[PDB]
């Protein structure tokens, strides 16, 4: 039982919905009622949004496009089942719903990639000879600047960035 | 065979560039670690750098074991002629 | 040319040519340059339980010859309670100085210059006077006391029998003060220095005639001095050698060239900079900083947009993309009576699913910004986020009613194709989505598992640090960074002059204007006494505003015409004068 | 907008604000000091944006330096850009409850006819300009802004006796400065600085306005 | 319909006029649903065929096997290589080399030329 509602574009939105879920006939083989079930949907967001907005038409008109995906009828089929209700289905559980492997995996391994992209990020000049005479950590730089000179020749400077301290070869 | 795998802050070229960079910092380090070593007591030119009077021991690197990769404006001798650095060379030719 | 007015007066403040006050004491603390050295803080100690273990003088005193040791008096004034309090009435304000300490150097770093080396000077008492390192002594611990409160009114550096000049001399010997009396405790003598009486004596004596003659003195031309004494290390070292470090360094300028960028007052340095601290679980995870970063991260369209195409389609329920066709299943009820109304030319975009990914931005926050940017005429759509190809469905509309030819159509027939390509041209370069203004595509992202940053206090009372996450950044936009959430408020600052004064003002620029200074310094690794540094500063932020050492700066300066001839514009200046 | 995150930058302001009149000396609560997000969500209903007010009534009298010259108010106008007709009505309003020093926390621009007029009435009564942009965060909390103490004329006059200067040959600060507009410090006032130091450990400055 | 459908509408610049020879450039016609492409010095007009009139960042246009003409195989002082079979005679002597463009981009790709002549084929590995 749904509540029923007077306003015409409200009906129609409600029958592209319960059209959408008859996209290939998969509720036939488990025979629920996806016109009452559309109806939930559409009430459900309607309880978020509460008007006729551009904003609730693309919400719903993006909850009917991930609805009639090909590539996954595995989300619709889990959904006809009432495995998910009409108010979980309100809000996505992902940026463009789509669990039940291909998209997720392919959208998860894209998340690893572009965490990727940060983490080393890239460090270290690299020599790790000298030791600290401060935190007695071997992880040093050495710089090599200016060469003969005259009264400060090319000397080797040794930096500990882990805790700023600074010493030549001495 | 493009199986490099660029590191998270560089671009391939770049990772190449810092690679193999560190790979040849690192080679002359070693044996310039092994010179100074493998010198006597005896050696003027290690009392000359002990004291602290001239030079340094990469100086000592220089003149004994190997001199380096040579540098200009913070990398490796650009390619003056169309993909190459001298016309003794082959074209695009990365190695040392 | 700029400082060379600036010396220290009979009074002792320096001051210029014209008589304003630079500094109260020459370089915040009346001591000349020539006689100070490098010495270490023992009272930055870690732990709580060390450092009242090492300093405070025992009562709780072994029932055994406890004592005997060390000292034979003690046996005199293990009795007295008066002697108790008094101790403790040290080991209380030494403990206070501590927290007052932790406070002025939030670095953990307990090297410090000072006059009078102490431990030398203590060592050099034990060798005088032949003191046994293992006997029990004559000394009294409270003429140490006293004795060192007496020696701190000895210290005097400007006269004070007035409140204000009273408090002028407090903390203008703070440093040294803290350092004197945490060095020479009643506990430190007795268990480490084993100093007699008369050696105390002495050694009184010496500090108070080694730091009276420190003290800098009046006439002595500091301007002159301290210019060249940053000058000279400018000499010193790299023009534009390179120094890798981490993934940034294609960052701030080294060097002469970045204190000739510094100096000036650039409007315009060659590599600005922020950096950038985070908060709450932002500093430690890096999935939440990729997510300030991105709102932070100034993106503009073009950035985004994988491919552009106009096409001829007159009306969609026959489009000549055969595939769009599955859209307009999907957009028949979009504002379905101006369908009649939206001109026959579209434009198609499509998007890359792990660029648009890596920014995390949504499609309809892009219809949403663009709609709202251009207006209602621009009438936009888009697809299913998970379609495989990303493509947003762009046609233009008009106002309906007002245009039936009235005139001539106010536009002059312009083609509506070449709109198209200016709403093309403007949409990319302009569109400003989720990322705001001018840090540019440059971003760093580093781990600060580098230098002595994030260190905190902790229960134990040690500076313990941590290792967190930060942001540098190629930019300018300081005021909207830090009005951003989740990045620190506190600590996130700029290499950038002009930007510190007018987001923090003039206080501010001294700081960082001294830390810039210091920073190029420290890099040729080559060290500048911090009175000299200090001296620059103030002398340049005197005016209120920013004087640059150009002669659009200081030759600005109400200073006489004579000494302004001098200086580079001569010939002008006299006739100006 | 029409968001939350709106919510926050309102309280956000609310909250430097608050601690600015704090510092001024102003009797403040310390309550509405340690006032959240969520608390203000609640304590001010926020509501959940489109209604009504969540500026014209956040609109705040405070009114307790220890010395009682009075209270002070603080108004935040709706519009993006405020003109003088505005201004003007304001005036009237806080005229006729008969204000003593008023603080305008403006949306985004501002009409240059309107800041001469608010120039212009300045000898008459007086009257403060912040964009909000500046508000958005504390700029007294940050790292590099030593402490700065604002003297009572008395004090001044003894800081010159006991140096034996004039008010000219101090070192100055400009009026249209960030910190002296922070704490709304008028022209020939000085302002006493405290910082940390690396050899004293503490040294004091002081500054002129000019 | 596929994604594996390639992305060459005709990008196409001329087919410039037929009676003065200058460029067209597209116009309106509201009654048939048509585009035209008109001279704008002279009265000729004529429909286009394909909708699109410019697409811009195909941001791909690899460029790997174009504009590479097969006669850089006769220069010396490009690496021969021992690296056999052509993958369309059976010959080696395939002569290689990096990107040769300032886009650069980034490209460590090698690309082969055979040398002799059965082929003047080039493929990318
Ligand atoms: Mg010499
Ligand atoms: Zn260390
Ligand atoms: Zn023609
Ligand atoms: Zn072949």
């Given at each position: 039982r749904a509540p029923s509602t007077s306003d015409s574009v409200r009906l129609k939105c409600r029958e592209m919905l319960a059209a959408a879920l008859r996209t290939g006939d998969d509720y036939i083989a488990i025979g629920a009622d996806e016109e009452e079930l559309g109806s939930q949907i559409e009430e459900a967001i309607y309880q978020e949004?509460?008007?006729?907005?551009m904003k609730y038409k693309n919400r719903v008109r993006s909850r009917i496009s991930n609805l009639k995906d090909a590539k996954n009828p595995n989300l619709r089929k889990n959904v006809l089942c009432g495995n998910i209700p009409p108010d979980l289905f309100?809000?996505?559980?992902?940026?463009?719903?789509?669990?039940?492997?291909l998209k997720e995996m392919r959208k998860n391994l894209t998340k690893e990639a572009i965490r990727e992209h940060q983490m080393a990020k890239t460090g270290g000049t690299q020599t790790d000879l000298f030791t600290c005479?401060?935190?007695?950590?071997?992880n040093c730089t050495y710089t090599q600047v200016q060469t003969?000179?005259?009264?400060?020749?090319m000397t080797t400077f040794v930096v500990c960035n882990e805790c700023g301290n600074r010493w030549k070869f001495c | 065979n493009n199986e490099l795998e660029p590191t998270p802050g560089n671009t391939l070229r770049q990772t190449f560039e810092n690679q193999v960079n560190r790979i040849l910092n690192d080679a002359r380090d070693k044996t310039g670690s092994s010179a100074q070593k493998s010198?006597?007591?005896?050696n003027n030119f290690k009392s000359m750098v002990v004291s602290g009077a001239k030079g340094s021991k990469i100086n000592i690197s220089q003149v004994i074991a190997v001199v380096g990769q040579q540098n200009v404006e913070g990398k490796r001798?650009?390619?003056?002629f169309k993909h190459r650095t001298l016309p003794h060379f082959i074209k695009d030719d990365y190695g040392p | 040319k700029s400082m060379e007015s600036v010396m220290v007066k009979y009074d002792a403040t320096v001051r210029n040519s014209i008589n304003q006050?630079?500094?109260?004491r020459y370089g915040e603390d009346?001591?000349?340059?020539?006689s100070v050295e490098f010495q270490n803080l023992?009272?930055?100690?870690?732990?709580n339980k060390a450092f009242e273990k090492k300093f405070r003088f025992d009562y709780?005193?072994?029932?055994?010859?406890?004592?005997?040791?060390?000292?034979?008096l003690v046996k005199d004034v293990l009795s007295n309670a008066h002697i108790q309090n008094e101790l403790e009435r040290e080991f209380e304000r030494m403990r206070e100085d501590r927290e007052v300490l932790r406070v002025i150097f939030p670095t953990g770093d307990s090297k410090v210059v000072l006059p009078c080396n102490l431990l030398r000077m203590i060592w050099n008492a034990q060798k005088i006077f032949?003191?046994?390192?293992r006997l029990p002594s004559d000394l009294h611990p409270i003429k140490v006391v006293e004795g060192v409160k007496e020696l701190s009114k000895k210290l005097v550096i400007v006269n004070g029998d007035d409140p204000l000049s009273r408090q002028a001399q407090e903390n203008a010997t703070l440093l040294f003060n803290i350092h004197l009396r945490s060095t020479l405790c009643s506990r430190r003598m007795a268990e480490?220095?084993?100093?007699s009486g008369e050696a105390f004596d002495w050694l009184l004596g010496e500090i108070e005639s080694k730091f009276n003659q420190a003290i800098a003195h009046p006439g002595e031309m500091v301007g002159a001095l301290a210019a060249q004494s940053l000058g000279e290390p400018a000499?010193?070292?790299?023009?534009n050698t390179f120094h890798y470090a981490?993934?940034?360094?294609?960052?701030v300028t080294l060097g002469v060239p970045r204190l000739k960028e510094l100096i000036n007052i650039?409007?315009?340095?060659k590599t600005p900079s922020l950096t950038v601290f985070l908060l709450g679980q932002s500093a430690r995870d890096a999935e939440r900083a990729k997510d300030i970063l991105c709102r932070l991260e100034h993106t503009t369209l073009r950035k985004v947009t994988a491919n552009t195409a106009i096409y001829y389609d007159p009306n969609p329920q026959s489009?000549?993309?055969?595939?769009?066709?599955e859209w307009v299943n999907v957009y028949y009820?979009?504002?379905?009576?101006?369908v009649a109304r939206i001109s026959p030319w579209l434009l198609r975009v499509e998007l890359d699913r792990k660029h648009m990914t890596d920014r995390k931005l949504t499609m309809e926050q892009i219809a949403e910004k663009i709609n709202a940017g251009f207006?209602?005429?621009?009438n936009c759509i888009f697809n299913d986020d998970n379609a495989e190809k990303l493509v947003l469905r762009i046609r233009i509309m008009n106002?309906?009613?007002?245009?039936?030819?009235?005139?001539?159509?106010?536009?002059?027939?312009?083609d509506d194709d070449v709109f198209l390509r200016c709403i093309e041209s403007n949409m990319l370069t302009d569109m400003t989505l989720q990322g705001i203004e001018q840090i540019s595509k440059v971003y760093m992202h580093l781990p600060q598992?580098?230098?002595?940053?994030?260190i905190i206090i902790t229960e134990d009372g040690e500076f313990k640090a941590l290792q967190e996450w930060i942001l540098e950044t190629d930019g300018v936009s300081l005021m909207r960074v830090l009005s951003?959430?989740?990045?620190?408020?506190?600590?996130?600052?700029?290499?950038?002059?002009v930007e510190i004064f007018t987001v923090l003002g003039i206080e501010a620029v001294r700081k960082a204007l001294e830390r810039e200074l210091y920073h190029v310094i420290s890099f040729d690794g080559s060290y500048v006494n911090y009175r000299h540094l200090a001296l620059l500063c103030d002398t340049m932020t005197c005016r209120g505003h920013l004087m640059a050492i150009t002669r659009h700066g200081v030759?600005?300066?109400?200073?006489?015409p004579l000494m302004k001839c001098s200086f580079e514009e001569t010939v002008d200046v006299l006739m100006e004068a | 907008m029409d968001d939350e995150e709106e919510t926050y930058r309102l309280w956000k302001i609310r909250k430097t604000i608050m601690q600015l009149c704090h510092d001024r000396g102003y009797l403040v609560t310390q309550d509405e000091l340690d006032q959240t997000l969520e608390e203000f969500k609640a304590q001010?209903?926020?509501?959940?944006?489109?209604?009504?007010?969540?500026?014209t009534d956040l609109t705040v009298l405070v009114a307790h330096?220890?010395?009682?010259?009075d209270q002070m108010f603080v108004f935040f106008p709706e519009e993006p850009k405020v003109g003088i007709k505005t201004i003007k009505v304001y005036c009237q309003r806080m005229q006729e409850e008969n204000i003593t020093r008023a603080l305008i926390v403006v949306q985004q621009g501002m009409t240059p006819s309107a800041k001469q007029s608010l120039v212009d009435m300045a000898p008459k009564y007086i009257l403060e300009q912040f964009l909000q942009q500046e508000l958005?965060?504390?700029?007294?909390?940050?790292?590099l802004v030593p402490e700065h103490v604002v003297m009572t004329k008395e004090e001044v006059t003894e800081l010159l006796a006991r140096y034996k200067?004039?008010?000219?040959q101090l070192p100055r600060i400009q009026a249209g400065d960030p910190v002296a507009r922070y704490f709304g410090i008028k022209r020939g006032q000085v302002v006493k600085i405290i910082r940390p130091s690396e050899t004293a450990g503490r040294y004091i400055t002081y500054r002129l306005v000019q | 319909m596929e994604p594996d459908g390639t992305y060459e509408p005709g990008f196409v610049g001329?087919?410039?006029?037929?009676?003065?020879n200058n460029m067209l450039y597209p116009k309106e016609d509201?009654?048939?649903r048509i585009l035209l492409y008109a001279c704008?010095?002279?009265?000729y007009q004529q429909e286009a065929?394909?909708?699109?009139?410019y697409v811009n960042?195909?941001?791909?246009?690899?460029?790997?096997?174009?504009?590479?003409?097969?006669?850089?195989?006769?220069?010396?002082t490009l690496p021969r290589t021992?690296?056999?079979?052509?993958q369309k005679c059976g010959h080696k002597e395939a002569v290689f080399f990096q990107?040769?463009?300032?886009?650069?981009?980034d490209a460590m790709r090698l690309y082969y030329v055979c040398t002799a002549p059965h082929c003047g084929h080039r493929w990318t590995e």
């Open positions: 949004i509460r008007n006729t907005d309100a809000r996505m559980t992902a940026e463009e719903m789509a669990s039940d492997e005479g401060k935190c007695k950590k071997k003969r000179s005259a009264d400060e020749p | 010198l006597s007591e005896y001798i650009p390619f003056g | 006050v630079v500094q109260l009346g001591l000349a340059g020539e023992a009272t930055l100690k870690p732990s709780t005193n072994e029932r055994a010859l406890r004592r005997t040791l060390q000292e034979d032949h003191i046994n390192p480490e220095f084993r100093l000499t010193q070292m790299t023009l981490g993934v940034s360094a294609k960052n650039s409007k315009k340095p489009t000549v993309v055969a595939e769009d066709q009820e979009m504002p379905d009576f101006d207006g209602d005429d621009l106002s309906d009613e007002n245009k039936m030819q009235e005139e001539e159509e106010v536009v002059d027939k312009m598992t580098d230098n002595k940053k994030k951003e959430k989740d990045v620190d408020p506190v600590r996130t600052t700029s290499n950038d002059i030759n600005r300066q109400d200073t006489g | 001010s209903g926020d509501k959940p944006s489109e209604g009504r007010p969540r500026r330096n220890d010395d009682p010259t958005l965060i504390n700029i007294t909390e940050h790292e200067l004039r008010e000219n | 001329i087919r410039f006029c037929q009676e003065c509201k009654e048939n704008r010095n002279c009265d065929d394909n909708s699109c009139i960042k195909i941001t791909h246009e690899v460029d790997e096997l174009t504009q590479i003409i097969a006669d850089v195989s006769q220069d010396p021992e690296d056999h079979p052509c990107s040769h463009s300032a886009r650069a981009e």
